[PDB]
């Protein structure tokens, strides 16, 4: 098969720069009538993939022409200039010479905005789950950047360890942060031997450690 | 406008057969082929293999020859994809699309499963000049479950997490808002979670404690 290699997973780029996303192939892409069966295609979160250059350096029909496509025949490169907030998502090369069809790998296109501090927020388990015995307590770490982020729960200020599980959302395209949850989960019995709920967050826009807490009961 | 309209989402049995289907309409369905991509859950692209709809013509992928079948009805403008022997590898997303790549059909969510469909608990975030509220979808199967905020009319400032799946072998997922603590007592918020495998809709009141 002709292997796609692309050798980037991610590349960051601010707002209004340009960027370039590199493709290789394990054979020539070339065909004796004389195009080259290379593609670019972008994937948005949730959504199909949607073409953005077809024969290696043609731009598809509505795609905007800040998108270019060029390549040697075993090396591509995708440019985008003018990046906006939009662009986000992954960019993918695919070889349409010979079957079977084959896809890179994927390049994710990160915008680098201004870091961002986390505003944190903190829900004890509501009432009506308590009544069915479990207890989720819920950290909030909204519009945030960059990605990293580390939540640590406190039990009456004890660290907790094997208990919490985390979610973190695709980065956002008009605002360029992420938001993330993270949910500790407790018997109701065991939940109510205890005063103190906090969450305590790490993140390169805060100095030091913020903490948001609760105590059970308000 | 033309439209490649996928069957929707599966939750189909070890070992069993899933036979997943692609409905074209706004153009001539025999003048074009059909391609089958195949997408792991956060994984990339891999191509299972196309057909002439005009022939009956196929190629495959050696990696699905022994497990897809690809056919196509003139008469419906339909093509479908049959995946024998299922195991939990073939569960993923699998698009359609027409040859080339331009038009594409929304992807239908196959997941192989033993496991029966159980419907989620929803319980609410209440809120503590802004302030964050939201609900928790707690211990459904299988996924997806989506959320809305007050039947469409709320959008901004709303992030609904990617679903976790616990040790209990059920998933979880919040979703939150972000609004005007002045709105926190003259706008009422309701998260409208849909759970179609159950049946389960809930819209969810969230008021301030």
């Known amino acids: 098969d002709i292997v796609m290699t692309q050798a980037a997973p991610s590349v960051p780029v601010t707002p209004g720069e340009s960027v370039s996303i590199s493709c290789r192939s394990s054979?020539?892409?070339?065909?004796?009538?004389?195009?080259?069966?290379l593609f670019w295609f972008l994937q948005r979160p949730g959504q199909s993939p949607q073409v953005l250059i077809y024969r290696m350096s043609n731009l598809a029909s509505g795609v905007p022409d800040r998108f270019s496509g060029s390549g040697s025949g075993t090396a591509f490169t995708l440019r985008i200039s003018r990046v906006e907030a939009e662009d986000v998502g992954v960019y993918y090369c695919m070889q349409h010479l010979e079957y079977p069809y084959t896809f890179g790998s994927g390049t994710r296109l990160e915008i680098k905005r201004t870091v961002a501090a986390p505003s944190v927020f903190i829900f004890p388990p509501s009432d009506e789950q308590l009544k069915s015995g479990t207890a989720s307590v819920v950290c909030l770490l909204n519009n945030f950047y960059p990605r990293e982020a580390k939540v640590q729960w406190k039990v009456d200020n004890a660290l907790q360890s094997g208990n919490s599980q985390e979610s973190v959302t695709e980065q956002d395209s008009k605002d360029s942060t992420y938001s993330l949850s993270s949910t500790l989960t407790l018997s109701k019995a065991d939940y109510e031997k205890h005063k103190v709920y906090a969450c305590e967050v790490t993140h390169q826009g805060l100095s030091s450690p913020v903490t948001k807490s609760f105590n059970r009961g308000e | 406008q033309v439209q490649l309209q996928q069957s929707g989402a599966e939750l189909v049995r070890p070992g069993t057969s899933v036979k997943v289907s692609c409905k074209a309409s706004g153009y001539a369905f025999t003048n074009y082929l059909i391609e089958w991509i195949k997408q792991r859950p956060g994984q990339g692209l891999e191509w299972i293999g196309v057909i002439n709809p005009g022939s009956g013509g196929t190629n495959y992928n050696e990696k699905f020859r022994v497990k897809a079948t690809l056919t196509a009805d003139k008469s419906s403008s339909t093509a479908y994809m049959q995946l024998s022997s299922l195991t939990s590898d073939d569960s993923a997303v699998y698009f359609c699309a027409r040859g080339g790549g331009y038009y594409w059909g929304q992807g239908t969510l196959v997941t192989v499963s033993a496991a029966s469909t159980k419907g989620p608990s929803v319980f609410p975030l209440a809120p503590s000049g802004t302030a964050a509220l939201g609900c928790l979808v707690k211990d459904y199967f299988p996924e997806p479950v989506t959320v809305s905020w007050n039947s469409g009319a709320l959008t901004s400032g709303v992030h609904t997490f990617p679903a976790v799946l616990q040790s209990s072998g059920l998933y979880s997922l919040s979703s939150v808002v972000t609004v005007p603590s002045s709105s926190l007592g003259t706008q009422t918020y309701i998260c409208n979670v849909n759970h179609k495998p159950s049946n389960t809709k809930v819209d969810k009141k969230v008021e301030p404690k």
């Open positions: 054979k020539s892409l070339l065909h004796s009538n004389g195009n080259t069966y």
